Design an enzyme around this catalytic site. Structure first.
Site, PDB file in Angstrom:
ATOM      1  N   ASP A 147       0.853  -1.183   0.000  1.00 14.74           N
ATOM      2  CA  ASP A 147       0.000   0.000   0.000  1.00 14.74           C
ATOM      3  C   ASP A 147       0.891   1.235   0.000  1.00 14.74           C
ATOM      4  O   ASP A 147       1.434   1.613   1.018  1.00 14.74           O
ATOM      5  CB  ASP A 147      -0.908  -0.038   1.236  1.00 14.74           C
ATOM      6  CG  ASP A 147      -1.975   1.070   1.247  1.00 14.74           C
ATOM      7  OD1 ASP A 147      -2.031   1.890   0.306  1.00 14.74           O
ATOM      8  OD2 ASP A 147      -2.772   1.093   2.209  1.00 14.74           O
ATOM      9  N   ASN A 150       0.267   4.730   2.457  1.00 10.12           N
ATOM     10  CA  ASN A 150       0.754   4.924   3.834  1.00 10.12           C
ATOM     11  C   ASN A 150       2.271   5.179   3.947  1.00 10.12           C
ATOM     12  O   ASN A 150       2.788   5.292   5.062  1.00 10.12           O
ATOM     13  CB  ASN A 150       0.295   3.761   4.747  1.00 10.12           C
ATOM     14  CG  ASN A 150       0.828   2.400   4.316  1.00 10.12           C
ATOM     15  OD1 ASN A 150       1.876   2.312   3.696  1.00 10.12           O
ATOM     16  ND2 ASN A 150       0.092   1.337   4.644  1.00 10.12           N
ATOM     17  N   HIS A 267      11.973  -0.957  27.776  1.00  9.41           N
ATOM     18  CA  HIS A 267      12.054   0.494  27.612  1.00  9.41           C
ATOM     19  C   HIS A 267      10.980   0.949  26.626  1.00  9.41           C
ATOM     20  O   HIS A 267      10.485   0.150  25.842  1.00  9.41           O
ATOM     21  CB  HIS A 267      13.445   0.906  27.080  1.00  9.41           C
ATOM     22  CG  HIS A 267      13.875   0.139  25.866  1.00  9.41           C
ATOM     23  ND1 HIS A 267      14.670  -0.987  25.951  1.00  9.41           N
ATOM     24  CD2 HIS A 267      13.603   0.309  24.549  1.00  9.41           C
ATOM     25  CE1 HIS A 267      14.879  -1.461  24.737  1.00  9.41           C
ATOM     26  NE2 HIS A 267      14.224  -0.707  23.870  1.00  9.41           N
ATOM     27  N   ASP A 276       7.426  11.614  27.022  1.00  7.13           N
ATOM     28  CA  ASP A 276       7.136  12.818  26.236  1.00  7.13           C
ATOM     29  C   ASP A 276       8.214  13.888  26.239  1.00  7.13           C
ATOM     30  O   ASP A 276       7.956  15.044  26.561  1.00  7.13           O
ATOM     31  CB  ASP A 276       5.762  13.407  26.621  1.00  7.13           C
ATOM     32  CG  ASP A 276       5.189  14.309  25.536  1.00  7.13           C
ATOM     33  OD1 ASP A 276       5.648  14.230  24.383  1.00  7.13           O
ATOM     34  OD2 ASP A 276       4.260  15.077  25.845  1.00  7.13           O
ATOM     35  N   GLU A 288       8.687  15.771  31.427  1.00  8.03           N
ATOM     36  CA  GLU A 288       8.139  17.135  31.499  1.00  8.03           C
ATOM     37  C   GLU A 288       7.794  17.589  32.905  1.00  8.03           C
ATOM     38  O   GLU A 288       7.861  18.784  33.201  1.00  8.03           O
ATOM     39  CB  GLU A 288       6.884  17.234  30.641  1.00  8.03           C
ATOM     40  CG  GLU A 288       7.117  16.889  29.190  1.00  8.03           C
ATOM     41  CD  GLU A 288       5.857  16.958  28.372  1.00  8.03           C
ATOM     42  OE1 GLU A 288       5.815  17.795  27.450  1.00  8.03           O
ATOM     43  OE2 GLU A 288       4.894  16.207  28.646  1.00  8.03           O
ATOM     44  N   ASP A 356      12.100  -8.571  23.516  1.00  5.36           N
ATOM     45  CA  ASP A 356      13.286  -7.774  23.271  1.00  5.36           C
ATOM     46  C   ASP A 356      14.113  -7.554  24.541  1.00  5.36           C
ATOM     47  O   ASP A 356      13.570  -7.242  25.606  1.00  5.36           O
ATOM     48  CB  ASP A 356      12.862  -6.431  22.671  1.00  5.36           C
ATOM     49  CG  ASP A 356      14.040  -5.562  22.299  1.00  5.36           C
ATOM     50  OD1 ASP A 356      14.877  -6.009  21.460  1.00  5.36           O
ATOM     51  OD2 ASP A 356      14.144  -4.443  22.860  1.00  5.36           O
ATOM     52  N   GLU A 396      14.742 -12.794  23.962  1.00  3.63           N
ATOM     53  CA  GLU A 396      16.033 -12.439  23.407  1.00  3.63           C
ATOM     54  C   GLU A 396      17.112 -12.543  24.474  1.00  3.63           C
ATOM     55  O   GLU A 396      17.068 -11.860  25.489  1.00  3.63           O
ATOM     56  CB  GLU A 396      16.035 -11.030  22.832  1.00  3.63           C
ATOM     57  CG  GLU A 396      17.404 -10.696  22.250  1.00  3.63           C
ATOM     58  CD  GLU A 396      17.530  -9.302  21.693  1.00  3.63           C
ATOM     59  OE1 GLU A 396      16.702  -8.426  22.002  1.00  3.63           O
ATOM     60  OE2 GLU A 396      18.483  -9.101  20.923  1.00  3.63           O
ATOM     61  N   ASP A 472      20.296  -7.846  14.021  1.00  6.95           N
ATOM     62  CA  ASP A 472      21.372  -7.325  14.857  1.00  6.95           C
ATOM     63  C   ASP A 472      22.755  -7.942  14.577  1.00  6.95           C
ATOM     64  O   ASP A 472      23.696  -7.672  15.302  1.00  6.95           O
ATOM     65  CB  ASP A 472      21.024  -7.508  16.340  1.00  6.95           C
ATOM     66  CG  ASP A 472      19.911  -6.586  16.796  1.00  6.95           C
ATOM     67  OD1 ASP A 472      19.792  -5.461  16.255  1.00  6.95           O
ATOM     68  OD2 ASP A 472      19.158  -6.986  17.702  1.00  6.95           O
TER      69      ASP A 472
END
Ligand SMILES: [Ca+2]
Ligand SMILES: [Ca+2]
Ligand SMILES: [Ca+2]
Length: 637
Positions: A147, A150, A267, A276, A288, A356, A396, A472
């Site tokens: 597609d 996108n 993480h 943020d 923040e 992960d 992993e 990796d």
């Protein structure tokens, strides 16, 4: 053999395949009957010695003669370890008069071993579809663009100052000046995977897809998660994912399929609203405000700019799992609307999680491999398996993952860097998986493989994710220096070994690539046909593996380790089939007398080499087969 004060090691065998263990995944109420092979008449007594974690002590079970094999060459001795809920570890003592040998997961020994015992872990099950399947790993930006609407364009957005860059299909992955390697896009997406399912499930025949991360994140790799609950718009929307899953699960377009997602739970990205850092949301993230609703999801050394993060990368702030029942444990796995449970429940019903950097997951900014890390994964298993007992959990880890597998309370399996990718690389290419010089002989390869299998319970061995390459490490075909035959050899080993064969997208045609990002090239649909010899071989090998349960869950016995001619042969066998794989890792052809008598292939029986289609007859315990350099035969009956 005879009673001659000598235990003959070449006649000894045990593993937890069907001929030798009647209950490889027993419950609390199932006893475990074990058989030990010897040469006929070789021994005077044998004993099972098992450590019981219930009472922290050894227990002794004398064995009795049970039977001969059909060829009359071998005895089987038997004994039973009783049923209980407790984890147990076992070895054998084998006596012929004044000669004693020991035997465990590491094979025979003159002295009593203190490691590598066989495992009995009551109530521990790994999913059988994972044991029996073939996996195909897709890095989604680089597989197929189903597609174009996108697609991320050059300058579509900026992240930490850098604009995105688009590349034409087939072009180089490296970022031109002013751009960043992590913000380079080709347009591969979920619609594209969906449209290429025929290739995966029929042209190759893989029944398990593993995707690198697919959730909203600014990079091309998407390990810096911004929203776990949304498919990244470049890849599709959550409805596209639902459609893809339905088509993977369908039996109308090939075999029943399974989907494993990449679970990036150590993480988040720095642009996740919980954090943020760039003020992308009207809500106040932890970066923040120290009054942020999510402040305690992260660990600050000096707020706001010094915080715990994956490998010190400020873009990957590390999640604080806290104590049992914490909000973070909630949003990742405990809650019904958690990341883990959302995708495992309807209307997604995915089939597993690849975890992960799973060893790192912790509380308080610590780096895991500790009591808290293991507690977290124990809770995670309960959460996942409570939703779907047949959902896979693969962690992993690049070393020995025993600490997360061998108590049956955490992962089903791990990424098999240490037990597969590395030894295969060093044997065939003379390089480690980062393309530095590191060569091993055949005897070394066999030993490495055995010792790494012995790190794991049998069900876990059978469920290990066995890839030649991944996102990796350097590409197998680069390590091979472009020699397609080195790939042919690697594929034949991969598809007949213990553990889930896992094809990193493009390895099946010989795709090259150095270090990240060059291991993530876009996929060529013209090079991805049976005209490429590696692709045709891959199809054949997947078909062979799917034909023979012995290749997926059978015993494994070494037959030949010839460092002169570089010949490695091993048998895969169960109650039905016997298969002798013969691999030639030399640069020249060799004619090999394969000792199929070791697998109890009867004299006068026939085998077929499934690689070529040629048939052979068993004579004087042997099959004689000519094998090309960097090639193999799969002699099955
Ligand atoms: Ca003897
Ligand atoms: Ca696209
Ligand atoms: Ca904000």
């Amino acid at each position: 053999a005879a009673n001659d004060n000598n235990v003959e090691w070449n006649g000894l065998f045990h593993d937890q395949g069907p001929l030798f263990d009647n209950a490889p995944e027993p419950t609390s109420t199932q006893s475990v009957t074990l058989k030990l092979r010897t040469f006929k008449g070789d021994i005077t007594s044998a004993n099972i010695k098992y450590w019981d974690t219930a009472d922290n002590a050894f227990h002794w079970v004398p064995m009795v003669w049970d039977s001969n094999d059909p060829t009359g060459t071998f005895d089987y001795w038997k004994g039973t370890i009783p049923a209980s809920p407790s984890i147990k570890y076992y070895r054998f003592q084998i006596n012929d008069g004044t000669s004693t040998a020991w035997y465990n997961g590491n094979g025979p020994s003159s002295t009593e071993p203190n490691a590598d015992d066989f495992y009995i872990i009551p109530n521990f099950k790994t999913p059988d579809w994972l044991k029996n399947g073939v996996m195909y790993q897709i890095f989604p930006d680089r597989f197929y663009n189903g597609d174009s609407s996108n697609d991320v364009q050059t300058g579509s957005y900026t992240y930490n100052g850098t604009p995105t860059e688009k590349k034409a299909w087939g072009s180089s992955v490296y970022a031109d000046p002013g751009y960043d390697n992590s913000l380079v896009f080709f347009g591969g997406d979920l619609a594209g995977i969906d449209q290429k399912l025929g290739y995966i499930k029929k042209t190759l025949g893989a029944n398990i897809l593993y995707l690198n991360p697919i959730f909203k994140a600014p990079t091309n790799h998407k390990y810096d998660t911004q929203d776990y609950m949304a498919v990244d718009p470049a890849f599709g929307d959550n409805s596209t994912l639902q459609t893809l899953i339905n088509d993977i699960h369908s039996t109308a377009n090939g075999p029943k399929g399974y989907l494993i997602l990449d679970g990036v739970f150590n993480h988040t990205g720095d642009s996740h609203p919980w954090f943020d850092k760039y003020n992308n949301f009207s809500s106040q993230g932890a970066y923040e405000s120290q009054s942020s609703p999510w402040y305690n999801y992260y660990t600050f050394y000096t707020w706001p700019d010094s915080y715990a993060s994956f490998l010190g990368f400020n873009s990957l702030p590390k999640l604080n799992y806290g104590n049992s029942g914490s909000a973070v444990r909630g949003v990742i796995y405990n809650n019904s609307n958690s990341v883990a449970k959302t995708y495992l429940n309807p209307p997604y019903s995915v089939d597993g999680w690849r975890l992960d950097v799973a060893n790192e997951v912790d509380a308080n900014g610590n780096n895991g491999s500790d009591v808290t890390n293991h507690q977290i994964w124990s809770e995670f298993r309960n959460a996942v398996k409570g939703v779907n007992s047949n959902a896979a959990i693969i962690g992993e880890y690049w070393g020995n993952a025993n600490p997360w597998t061998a108590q049956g309370n955490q992962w089903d399996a791990a990424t098999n860097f240490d037990g597969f990718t590395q030894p295969v690389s060093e044997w065939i290419t003379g390089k480690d998986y980062q393309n530095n010089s590191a060569s091993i002989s055949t005897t070394q390869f066999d030993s490495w493989l055995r010792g790494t299998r012995a790190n794991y319970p049998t069900n876990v061995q059978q469920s290990m994710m066995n890839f030649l390459s991944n996102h990796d490490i350097t590409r197998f075909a680069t390590r091979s220096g472009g020699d397609l035959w080195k790939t042919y050899l690697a594929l034949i080993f991969q598809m007949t070994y213990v553990g889930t064969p896992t094809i990193y997208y493009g390895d099946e045609y010989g795709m090259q690539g150095g270090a990240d990002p060059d291991n993530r090239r876009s996929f060529d649909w013209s090079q991805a046909t049976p005209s490429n010899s590696a692709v045709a071989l891959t199809q054949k090998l997947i078909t062979i593996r799917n034909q023979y349960p012995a290749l997926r869950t059978g015993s494994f016995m070494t037959l030949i380790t010839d460092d002169t001619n570089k010949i490695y042969s091993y048998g895969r066998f169960d109650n039905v089939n016997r298969i002798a794989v013969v691999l030639n890792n030399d640069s020249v052809s060799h004619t090999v007398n394969v000792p199929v008598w070791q697998l109890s292939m009867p004299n006068g029986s026939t085998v077929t080499d499934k690689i070529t289609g040629h048939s052979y007859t068993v004579q004087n315990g042997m099959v004689t087969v000519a094998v090309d350099g960097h090639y193999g035969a799969v002699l099955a009956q």
